[PDB]
Amino acid sequence: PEMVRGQVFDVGPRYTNLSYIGEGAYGMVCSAYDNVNKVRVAIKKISPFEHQTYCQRTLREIKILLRFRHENIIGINDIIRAPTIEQMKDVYIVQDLMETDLYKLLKTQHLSNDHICYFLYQILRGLKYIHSANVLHRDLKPSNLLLNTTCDLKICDFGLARVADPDHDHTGFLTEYVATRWYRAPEIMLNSKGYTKSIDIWSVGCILAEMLSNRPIFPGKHYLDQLNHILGILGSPSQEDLNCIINLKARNYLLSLPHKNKVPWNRLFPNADSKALDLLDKMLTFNPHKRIEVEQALAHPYLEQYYDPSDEPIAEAPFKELDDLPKEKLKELIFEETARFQP
Numbered sequence: 001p002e003m004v005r006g007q008v009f010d011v012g013p014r015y016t017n018l019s020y021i022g023e024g025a026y027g028m029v030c031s032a033y034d035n036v037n038k039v040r041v042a043i044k045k046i047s048p049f050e051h052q053t054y055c056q057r058t059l060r061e062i063k064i065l066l067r068f069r070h071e072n073i074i075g076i077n078d079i080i081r082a083p084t085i086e087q088m089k090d091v092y093i094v095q096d097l098m099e100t101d102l103y104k105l106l107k108t109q110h111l112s113n114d115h116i117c118y119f120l121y122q123i124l125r126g127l128k129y130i131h132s133a134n135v136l137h138r139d140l141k142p143s144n145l146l147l148n149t150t151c152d153l154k155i156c157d158f159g160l161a162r163v164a165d166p167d168h169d170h171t172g173f174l175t176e177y178v179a180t181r182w183y184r185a186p187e188i189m190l191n192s193k194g195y196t197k198s199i200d201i202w203s204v205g206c207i208l209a210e211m212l213s214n215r216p217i218f219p220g221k222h223y224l225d226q227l228n229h230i231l232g233i234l235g236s237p238s239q240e241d242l243n244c245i246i247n248l249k250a251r252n253y254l255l256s257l258p259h260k261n262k263v264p265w266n267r268l269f270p271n272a273d274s275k276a277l278d279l280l281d282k283m284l285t286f287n288p289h290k291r292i293e294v295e296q297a298l299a300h301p302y303l304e305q306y307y308d309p310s311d312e313p314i315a316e317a318p319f320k321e322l323d324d325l326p327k328e329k330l331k332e333l334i335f336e337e338t339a340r341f342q343p
């Protein structure tokens with residue numbers, strides 16, 4: 001078998017001439033030549049069966065991405081694994097090959113206003129399809145946005161994705177959360193489980209602000225520091241927005257803070273387009289009920305050059321209990337979900 005960075009990467013005979021792209025705690029990514037379609041693809045090696053969390057993330061992604069088909073969403077072209085559950089240790093997911101991710105781009109490249117506009121359009125176009133399927137991504141950030149050499153954008157990593165559940169979204173103050181800290185909506189730290197569509201719109205708002213300055217807008221160093229970064233810019237929530245927070249611990253925490261005025265967007269981003277800042281304000285709205293939705297965001301004057309609701313497709317059907325399932329049972333479901341790719 002072929003070896004990459006002192007690790008086994010057996011994807012043959014169909015996929016050859018491997019090249020290391022990057023790594024993650026939940027898998028290794030390589031580029032490879034597809035001998036059937038005569039095109040280079042991306043291959044992600046995952047080894048999840050010893051950890052329940054790893055198994056859950058693997059299954060969520062495989063189930064969702066096999067059901068999804070959209071230009072701004074990474075696809076699953078093929079899945080490589082052993083012919084039996086007993087012999088299956090690693091799973092190789094074959095996906096679209098892209099040049100880079102938005103995290104890598106923002107470290108060294110200044111984006112033109114036209115690039116910010118086009119990237120944001122593609123993010124929201126992909127997000128419209130995800131939300132129309134009653135799915136939440138829940139981990140939108142620049143590293144989960146892939147770009148090819150012609151600036152085509154694809155949303156990836158559906159490991160933390162869930163079916164929207166607005167009726168069961170309420171929770172206590174400072175409830176533990178898994179998704180990336182800097183892109184977490186304020187209500188996560190106050191009274192939300194992150195089971196509504198508004199959670200993804202906040203992350204997109206954070207991504208827009210980061211595209212405008214090449215710096216994360218709310219770089220919290222720990223759980224509660226994240227909320228103070230958000231409030232440091234948005235200012236003290238209004239009486240109406242506070243009255244929407246019924247939980248006493250969360251409400252009294254906000255009430256205990258000295259009054260803070262809103263830092264204007266034009267002071268943080270003096271070179272930014274005024275229409276981009278108006279849309280930013282609407283995505284980075286404190287109250288999740290008042291926060292702009294994905295279809296409104298697409299119809300905003302900032303995206304007028306691209307907006308076409310007839311060319312912004314939705315899922316053919318909505319998508320629809322993996323948290324309380326043993327890793328041995330999750331392995332069985334992963335085997336069953338990947339069966340269609342076996343010869």
Ligand SMILES: O=C(N[C@H](CO)c1ccccc1)c1cc(-c2[nH]ncc2-c2cccc(C(F)(F)F)c2)c[nH]1
Nearest residue numbers: 022023024026027029042095097098100101144157
């Ligand atoms: O699934 C992909 N990315 C996620 C994280 O977002 C992931 C999860 C766990 C471990 C590794 C990766 C994924 C990326 C790609 C991809 N295709 N073409 C290029 C890339 C790419 C680009 C930049 C960085 C990386 C990565 F993930 F290796 F760091 C991969 C395909 N699938």
